[PDB]
């Protein structure tokens, strides 16, 4: 597919196609650089360009593999904040669906695995490197991900309220109040915990939850 060439002329056209936004052949040229020339001076920027191109081409598993390779191979690279931010970006884009976004379906009820991965990713970024230029947007995404992860537990508690599983409701809202105490989903899920307490004749616990709700009315 890609001919054998010395580093400069092939990296020049790889950079040109990537810098013109033509991701599909940009990936092919950069992969040619990667497999032919693994340890050349270009290798670091080639791997970074692989990360960027795989993210832009929606090849998210390949982007995650490239980011894993970069972090494992170069733990002390000067721009590992960029690859950690890109890793969080890949996870948070993996927690998405185009059709459901078009139809306005709230995806908080869906699999929170990628959202938890993105939260851990951005939390590591903002804790390790607060002065990085991606840190503000990382914190905004952290707030969004915390709200989403609270809403998933709220949806589970709502289902178990429908089912009549009162111990499950109480445990779910307790986990909400333990993990995401400051979220609007936890604020909305406190009445579910109070109702579940009342359904098992646990009037003292119900009164305590009612005191919390009244104090935060």
């Amino acid at each position: 597919e890609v001919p054998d060439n010395p580093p400069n002329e092939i990296y020049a056209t790889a950079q040109q196609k990537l810098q013109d936004g033509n991701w599909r052949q940009a990936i092919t040229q950069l992969e040619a650089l990667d497999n032919r020339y693994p340890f050349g001076p270009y290798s670091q920027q080639v791997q970074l360009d692989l990360i960027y191109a795989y993210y832009k081409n929606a090849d998210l598993p390949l982007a995650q593999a490239a980011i894993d390779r970069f972090i494992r191979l170069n733990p002390t690279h000067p721009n590992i904040d960029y690859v950690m931010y890109m890793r969080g970006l890949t996870n948070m884009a993996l927690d998405d669906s185009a059709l459901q976004g078009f139809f306005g379906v709230d995806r908080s009820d869906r699999d929170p695995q990628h959202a938890r991965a993105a939260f851990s990713d951005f939390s590591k970024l903002v804790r390790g490197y607060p002065n990085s230029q991606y840190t503000t947007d990382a914190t905004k995404r952290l707030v969004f991900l915390k709200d989403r992860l609270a809403k998933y537990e709220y949806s589970v508690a709502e289902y178990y309220t429908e089912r009549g599983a009162w111990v499950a409701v109480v445990n779910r809202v307790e986990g909400m109040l333990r993990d995401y105490p400051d979220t609007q989903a936890t604020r909305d899920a406190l009445p579910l915990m109070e109702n579940a307490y009342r359904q098992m004749q646990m009037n003292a616990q119900a009164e305590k939850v009612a005191k919390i709700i009244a104090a935060n009315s």
Partner: peptide, 21 residues
């Protein structure tokens, strides 16, 4: 795990084991 499109309740309503039991 893996319910990228399906709601949690869609899978959870087929359950016969209950949480907290």
């Amino acid at each position: 795990e893996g319910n990228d499109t399906s709601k949690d309740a869609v899978l959870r309503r087929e359950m016969r084991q209950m949480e907290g039991a």
